[PDB]
Nucleic acid binder design. Structure first.
Lengths: 261, 256, 216, 56, 217, 47
DNA sequence: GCTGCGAGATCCGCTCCGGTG
DNA sequence: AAACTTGATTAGGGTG
DNA sequence: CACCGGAGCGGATCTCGCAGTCGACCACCCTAATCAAGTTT
DNA sequence: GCTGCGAGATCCGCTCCGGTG
């Protein structure tokens, strides 16, 4: 989606949204949108698969609650203790369920336990322990646990197994519970991943960096070659590149590109 | 009718009237009537604040539910200015209900009366509900932050105001590419549809009812209320089950 | 889509409840203490929270054919088919999925202190790192299918409407007074289709002359 | 009926954007808003999956 | 064809504006008083008299990229492509063009009074007397290319039928979906010629990954 | 004709038939692979 | 590089229901 | 001796 | 031999003139010319 | 005791004559 991208930064420098809203509106690959926000100083002046996990005690049952930061999608499972190693098991299985890119958490032992961090490295996750400072995520996560314990309190009498009812709250909140036009956080996530796929098959050429020389036309008259600059988003018959002059993404048809091998 | 089947589900799982509407495609005023009537869990609904930004008294409106907003820059927080503001505010919408606090122009008798002229629910009280209050706060903070982005870009302040408004209402999106405006439009769709399809028709009526066993008519049962009269059917609570039921009008005796 | 199959499997005295999706081939597994009904009720609750099944196959074994299990598949609202699994298309994939399951367990389990971390490893290899065809993995197929469901849903929900405008088409000359109501057969950019009632005649109608309407 | 000319302006605005209702007893507001629901891109974009044939 | 390249070159304090045809290898050159835009405008008016350019390459030099030089290219309706010279396909030809040129100049300039006479000599050697393949000169390749570009050649193609085709693309042998349908641009043997809609690229498709579409009846 | 690899030239190839000219590039058979190619006009020498 | 349709009173073409030689 | 150049403020023409 | 096309005539449809005969004033946006002050050769 | 009609240019339909497999 070469065309959408310059146009989307153009919208953003004006209107200063989430990278979300640009990705969704303009139908681009999102990480370009995230780049625009990171390349929009204004939204860096004022400030997918990203999670936060907080152990929570309900009725003397340690509940390890993963909270996805964007969709509001959540996971949890009853955990025996706050041990590092049990949490290592839980994040191995949980990493088998999800495709987490990144994580927030506090400094509690299992998260800062060294081989846990070595294991988050072993799976290729960015783990950030720290006193979480962000009301963006912390409102979501606080609210998440309030709704969690309240809805557990609704559901647990209906089931023999507290694990079955824990699954109950997971069902009601991630599936049954919806918003807006019918958005469960699950289906939000499903969308996030499916749209991550199609960029992802483009990402394999993107992770390797190319540079190019590039030019543009005036009344069809080609200007001189410009760059060397990175090949930012590969299109069909074109790419995207940034104008170093205007600080703006720009489409260049492959004819008006020379890739720098 | 999906409405009694949705009710059968909420009596089990107890979701949000949000998610009951969304799941079942039932009305949200229906769905809200469920959550109000479900003892387990026991729209067009807004809130106002005034606030100052750069010594600019600015009226605010924030929908409670879609989250979508309106505001206007204001000369003073007085009654009559507000009265015209809510004339127009009403005018841009079809508001059913509101929350606000006890402030003078809000609680003001001609202004309250004026709600009654509009025939609308006004509630002043120290707003207690963290559901609303966080969203209100996010609105103000986000908003004046977005002014702080945008207002240098504009000759006019209230142009820039329109700008921040656009950002939050529209250009911002969440979920599936839902700005709150998307949400609201969808809400008003099925809600005006249920409203037109249901509310103005008939109110406060009882009936006798039966159910069919292999098509064999049951005894006439009740008397109970007709909760939502449908097209060719109704909605009724069987008293024994504590569950709502679609009943076909042929199996109804409307009690006059 | 979202049609699954369960089988119990024993990998070195560790009972493992093996959920197998039929189309995408995306798999789930979790370690099991016993094959009893109640434990499977917990597992299919959690699993129904993690995966959003329509439907299921399995054998006739006690936990599945157990009463409150079945009642719980209805309370969760899944189609549960118990019976002698007869289908080569399924049972080929079920069998090979078990074969590759214990294959890759036997690969990864030395590498991991906990066995559930290891079986989690195998789930990762097959669900995710395994790639075939043009290079899509199973979880990509599955996520794509879940999305495709909702695509069907919304696409329907706009099909459901059948809107009718008013228009001003032909009749002598220039522009006439408003006409219809006739329903939107097809949307254009700047135009649509209608029928002409009088002539029964479909028409290419520019939205310059079109007013759009709910029939009711 | 009003203190304000412009509240009366609101009143006219109200009425004809709403209270004027006709044909099937619908405002313009009905139709705009309805069509915004029908102006939606996704259901609108979703339909691509449906088959094409060509024809002569 | 008619895709040319220029590079100025100095040979013994004589600027030589060396036209290079990117296909035939035919060239034009002349001794030039200065690399100025204006003199170059005159040179390319003469040259557009002696040749019929569609298109051009050159470097970004001042004469070429000059505004009224560009306006002159458009006044003549020629495609002017200025750039960092980045191609070894054509820059091989241009490199050995100037090397061979200075070689032949160094041969002939004693043999004639004027350097313009001898420079013309080099043009004669390399355009006319230079022969290759079956004995075709590069000037012969140019005339042949020009002679074969005729719109009476367009006429016959316009008379013909077209048939249409779906097509697919194999990746590691994994066939893509049928696509389009599209024109058969040309019937091949075991293949045909089409264009990609998506990439706007001429493509060959194997006749099995062609489905030849039936005509009306 | 000749081909590129990362832009870098292959040697001249052919002679092979002039089969279908397009805009900017043509069609030849690759005699090596028994499969047709397309070659930029600048990348061709006709005979 | 753009186009008179809309608000306001009247009246014929039809149907549903009631009276009766 | 002459010339050449720039910031604000008034005279005409086209839309409500 | 039925369907379609071309030329001529009839029925239907939209816009405007006769109501005397036409021109000032306010406000905003766009285009253009001259005085006081500052440079050189 | 007084009331809007007619001229201009298009657009569609009907009739007579001629061409097509």
């Amino acid at each position: 989606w070469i065309e959408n991208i310059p146009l989307a930064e153009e919208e953003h420098n004006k209107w200063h949204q989430d990278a979300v809203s640009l990705h969704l509106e303009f139908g681009i690959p999102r990480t370009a949108a995230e780049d625009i926000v990171q390349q929009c100083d204004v939204c860096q002046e004022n400030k997918i698969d990203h999670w936060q996990v907080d152990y929570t005690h309900y009725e003397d049952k340690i509940i390890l609650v993963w909270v996805e930061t964007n969709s509001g999608l959540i996971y949890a499972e009853r955990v025996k203790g706050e041990t590092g190693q049990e949490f290592r098991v839980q994040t191995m299985k949980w990493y088998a369920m999800f495709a987490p890119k990144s994580l927030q958490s506090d400094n509690g032992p299992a998260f800062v336990a060294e081989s846990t961090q070595l294991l988050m490295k072993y799976l290729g996750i960015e783990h950030t322990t720290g006193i979480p400072w962000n009301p963006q995520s912390q409102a979501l996560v606080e609210r998440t646990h309030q709704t969690l314990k309240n809805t557990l309190e609704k559901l647990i009498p209906m089931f023999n197994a507290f694990e079955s009812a824990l699954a109950g709250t997971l069902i009601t909140l991630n599936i049954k519970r919806k918003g807006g036009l019918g958005t469960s956080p699950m289906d939000i996530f499903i969308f996030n991943k499916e749209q991550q796929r199609i960029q992802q098959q483009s990402k394999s050429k993107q992770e390797k960096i190319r540079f190019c020389y590039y030019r543009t036309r005036k009344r069809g008259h080609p200007g001189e070659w410009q760059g060397p600059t990175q090949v930012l988003w590969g299109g069909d018959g074109a790419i995207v590149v940034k104008d170093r002059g205007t600080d703006r993404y720009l489409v260049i048809a492959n004819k008006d590109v020379k890739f720098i091998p």
